[PDB]
Amino acid sequence: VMNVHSTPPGIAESHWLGNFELLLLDNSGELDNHSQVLYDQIKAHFGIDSIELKKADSLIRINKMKNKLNKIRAEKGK
């Protein structure tokens, strides 16, 4: 209605959760050094009691279990 985003667009810390899901989907799970550094910045800036860390944990484990479905596909493949 206002066309106003939930996070401010002028703050580079606002797009950390936006970039985390894009990097995690680009890597297709199995978090690398860049994703671990980004999780470290979220852990440093936002607290342990933060919605960004809760959503990051949820995305990490849903893509981990998605990779486990690919692991399930690995036996019946080839």
Added chain:
Amino acid sequence: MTKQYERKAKGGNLLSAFELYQRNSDKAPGLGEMLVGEWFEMCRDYIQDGHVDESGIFRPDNAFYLRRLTLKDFRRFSLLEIKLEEDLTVIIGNNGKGKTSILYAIAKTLSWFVANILKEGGSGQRLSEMTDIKNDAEDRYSDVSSTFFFGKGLKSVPIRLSRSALGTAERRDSEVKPAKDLADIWRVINEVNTINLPTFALYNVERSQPFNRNIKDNTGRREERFDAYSQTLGGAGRFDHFVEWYIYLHKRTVSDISSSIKELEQQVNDLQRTVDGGMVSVKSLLEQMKFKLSEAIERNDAAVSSRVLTESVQKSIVEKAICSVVPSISNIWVEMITGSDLVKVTNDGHDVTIDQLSDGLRVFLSLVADLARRMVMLNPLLENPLEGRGIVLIDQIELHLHPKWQQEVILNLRSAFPNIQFIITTHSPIVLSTIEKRCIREFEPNDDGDQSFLDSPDMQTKGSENAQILEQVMNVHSTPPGIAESHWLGNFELLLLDNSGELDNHSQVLYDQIKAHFGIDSIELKKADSLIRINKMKNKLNKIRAEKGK
């Protein structure tokens, strides 16, 4: 006694050299040769040293700000201690928590600084004895205690402002002597050599005022530096002074500096034409223009000379500040029509005159323009006069502003004025979404006045969602509890778990109300559908677990 003061001056102190300057300045040279000069040079260094960092912003070596504020029996506060940040301090709370009272007390404290800078031995504003005294308190006096920081040589500048109700046995008084001393140092070094005075400003609710545009307030004074302190802590931004100053700058830019000074000499030549026409009979305009030349001699010499920078650069800097901070206005310029001189801006690509600007884009321009005016008039020895020191007290920065424009107001203000300690008191979560956790003071919604501290919120607000800031910091539901249409998901889950997850008689018709109300593409119906599928296949898991168990 002299040796101890000289040792303290060698160790680093602004005040220790001041009485040395005051005791050796009154005698003759020879006994004062290099003696007064070294303390003057060291004092002017301690005021004027600054460096450009890696980001390109001038940062003073001796920053000036307010450290602590203590209110005892003041209005609703029994004994409240507030620790203020260096760059930005935000005070949030309900209507009723004394967060305008804090700004009022700090403004009453800064009034002594302003008055003692402006006139030697001056008196600032005083506390009222009818409303500021706590009507529950039994001591019948109220004091406001502040501490100021002015570098490593000046750790503490205490000040107390006391006021007693009428009928007390002991008359409580102020201890404004360190404020007197610091403003005395600034004024008596400014009278003999130009420095960069700090900006003290208060933008209270009364900036929300209509524009008259027929304003012929006293013409002639609105170009002198100490006019910048005129009613600066009143509460309302002096947009009248700004627009008069800006018409002055437009006339001086287009006429007085493009092809030298002409509008005075043309009527000087008119007097030389009419001086020998016979009977003179022109004594009314013989002398009223003769001191206009004296005015342009003894007032414009400061502005053109080495103390105050070039006037076209002043116009460019205030225009750059206005179009940088003020959101949709991108240019500001003056038209001269026959008999009229009016300022117009480019608001969203439309040339709009000031008086018919919107009330949410004009009372922020009244802040930014007046603040930029006072910085460019009070800090003229800088490449960017917006990087000067000072204390600015904005009350409700989110006033009349759209939530689109609240996402960048304090970022733009802190970008344009880096060395100003802003002290703002907002109500909106969206402003808090651009402000760090440590910059926020808060009031709990049970705060009868007994607290001795104001503390930051637990969660970080710099990148959090507006619903999270509203529902964790400001203690407000995201969906209203006074609406029966908002609890429909909760009643849906209660009536759906009553019959073990089946849409039999109540859940189906209440689902029909949700679908007919919120809409087909609604996120509430999306949660409702997801919970319907998850709880209808839960009975399958119940049957499978029952078959496994027995």
Added chain:
Amino acid sequence: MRELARLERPEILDQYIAGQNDWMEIDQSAVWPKLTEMQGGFCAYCECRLNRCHIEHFRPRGKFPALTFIWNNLFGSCGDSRKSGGWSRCGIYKDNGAGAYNADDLIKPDEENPDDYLLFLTTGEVVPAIGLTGRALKKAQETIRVFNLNGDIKLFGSRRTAVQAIMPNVEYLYTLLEEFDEDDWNEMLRDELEKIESDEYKTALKHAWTF
């Protein structure tokens, strides 16, 4: 809330006896490592992370003065008493707000199971459990009314967003029930029972995951 396994009585409170001295005489640091082993460092009233914490007496000390030094009365409290007013949940709210209440009108997490009397919905709101009538229903209303779960904003919104943050997880893990087999699909739910205890909210996510 959670089953708290009342393991062993500490030997700190055996020497001090009620009536001779008040609660303030004992040092407060010798009981917290005993309590955090069975609580996980959690307020067991708001089911609740202890960033700041203090010791809360389940039954009040002023009314039952010879009950404080039994160790069946000591629990953790969401927040601390040093706030000049305190919070409005868990331990502070019972001693400051609410009103009159009975000792048997409260649920005790040491032996009584809170799973079959109160129910955490997916929206973060607590309701009484289905089929519950009478004295236990009045108890289930009274505990929520004195502990402010249906109540203060910082608890209710945080529980709501913690439950709502795993709804795609629950949906996509449950929609593959026919795709996966019995033992390796219940291995997912034992993975959740090994997952959820390193969080703030445990029984709410238990009610969101299974029933």
